Amino acid sequence: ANTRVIELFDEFTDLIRDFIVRHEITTPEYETIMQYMISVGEAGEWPLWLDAFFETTVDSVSYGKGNWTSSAIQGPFFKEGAPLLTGKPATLPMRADEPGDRMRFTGSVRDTSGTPITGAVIDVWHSTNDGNYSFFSPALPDQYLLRGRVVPAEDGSIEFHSIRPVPYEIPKAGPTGQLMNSYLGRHSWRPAHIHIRITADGYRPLITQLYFEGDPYLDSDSCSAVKSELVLPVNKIDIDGETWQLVDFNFILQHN
Amino acid sequence: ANTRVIELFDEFTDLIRDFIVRHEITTPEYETIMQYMISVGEAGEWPLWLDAFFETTVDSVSYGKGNWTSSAIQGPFFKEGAPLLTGKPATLPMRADEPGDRMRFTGSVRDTSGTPITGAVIDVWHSTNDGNYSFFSPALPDQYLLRGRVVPAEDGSIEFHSIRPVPYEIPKAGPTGQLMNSYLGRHSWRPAHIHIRITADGYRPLITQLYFEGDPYLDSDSCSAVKSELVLPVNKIDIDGETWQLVDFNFILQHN
Ligand SMILES: Oc1ccc(O)c(O)c1
Ligand SMILES: [Cl-]
Ligand SMILES: [Fe+3]
């Protein structure tokens, strides 16, 4: 689109060139940068690397604060074609003895006023206790597991159980890992989270994630994605052997 | 941990983050970028694209103007290992019936004091008429074509023969070319240039380029790397009833 790209480019160009000058970026520097950017290309990191530092912001622009439910970063992990789920307590598809703490999510889907949005479909997915997002892991089938679509009751409410997601270290060994881990000498962890997308004819898509109080990497997310409005109050319930974690959330929507 | 790296990178990201924001960079735009960035690596174009937009700027910090020869950007197409050329007249390795006007290059290398620098070796590389560089074109073989190393005579003069470069167009079909030609509605032409590198014990290495007077793209370089001081007159002075191009430059080197 010619005129828009023309605008941004030139301004982008000047921005970097000015960055190069003010910091007298030398040739070996240039060369390391270029080398590095090649690295990222050579592995599959661009959506990873870009989503890590920049989408939080591409996000803040696209949907922006206010009394909706706040969006959050989509991530390089979504997968279309999730199953419609409808069972006893409507569970995410998971292996047997999928490990560690069991989880319960409860909530609403109402519009500005507060009137339940019946025609909502609602995708959700999240990483195994073990840091792996199926479809993106040698360890895991290329199937629907901890992924799935859920419909709201006409009363408003929704429910699903899954397992409790936990802190994920982005590949220590990736260009992004090295950048986060070694050169910047910080860490490659995100807080425990659950990604969520919500369609509805006649409203505006929403895409967000939720995290957990007492989450050690809340203040320090690698991907600077955590808004506070989206940290989950967490009830640790001990239904014998299997310790459960229950969580509640009320979604409100854009509404075209 | 790298504090240069810490400091530049944080600023780098805050800028980009600023940039995204003031310009309302929308998700679809974001993705097109990512898609672009990716397709740049796939075309192995980082060192193309990057040098085209930024090497001019890195060049100007990390080497200064003065009574020695002005440097210029290296570009993506340098190769280490070109052969020493020693000859009746030294001649760059060239395919049979290699298309273009026969060019004859003369000059010298001396120091800021006037003394010939007899210990210098001069790398030279330029494109084929056809606008291709060896080792960087699937249309030429990975062998040293139109690359070689000349050394000056005891009296410090240099001479090589070769074909005379012509204006070069970054392939319109690349991601880089597509950006420049289509997306920005500009062109992607550089003027005929000869890349030079001089190294010599005692001296700071020089990498530069030589342009030709009249060169139609002179006032309009895609990479925007021409410098008036580096535009050689061309003397079309014929011999054996055949059409030579005569070009002469005197190199001057800084000490250390
Ligand atoms: O950025 C560039 C592109 C093409 C060239 O021939 C060159 O020397 C530099
Ligand atoms: Cl060598
Ligand atoms: Fe995730």
From Swiss-Prot, chains A, B:
Disulfide bonds: none annotated. GO terms for biological process: catabolic process; catechol-containing compound metabolic process. PROSITE patterns: INTRADIOL_DIOXYGENAS (PS00083). It is an enzyme of class 1 (oxidoreductase). Pfam families: Dioxygenase_C, Dioxygenase_N. Its cofactor is Fe(3+). Fe cation binds at Y133, Y168, H193, H195. It catalyses: 4-chlorocatechol + O2 = 3-chloro-cis,cis-muconate + 2 H(+); 3,5-dichlorocatechol + O2 = (2E,4E)-2,4-dichloromuconate + 2 H(+). Binds 1 Fe(3+) ion per subunit. It comes from the Bacteria. Keywords: Aromatic hydrocarbons catabolism, Dioxygenase, Iron, Metal-binding, Oxidoreductase. InterPro entries: Catechol_dOase_N (IPR007535), Chlorcchol_dOase (IPR012817), Intradiol_dOase_C (IPR000627), Intradiol_dOase_core (IPR015889), Intradiol_RC_Dioxygenase (IPR050770). Gene3D superfamilies: Aromatic compound dioxygenase (2.60.130.10). The keyword Iron applies. Its EC number is 1.13.11.-. Transmembrane segments: none annotated. GO terms for molecular function: catechol 1,2-dioxygenase activity; ferric iron binding. Belongs to the intradiol ring-cleavage dioxygenase family. This is Chlorocatechol 1,2-dioxygenase. It comes from Rhodococcus opacus.
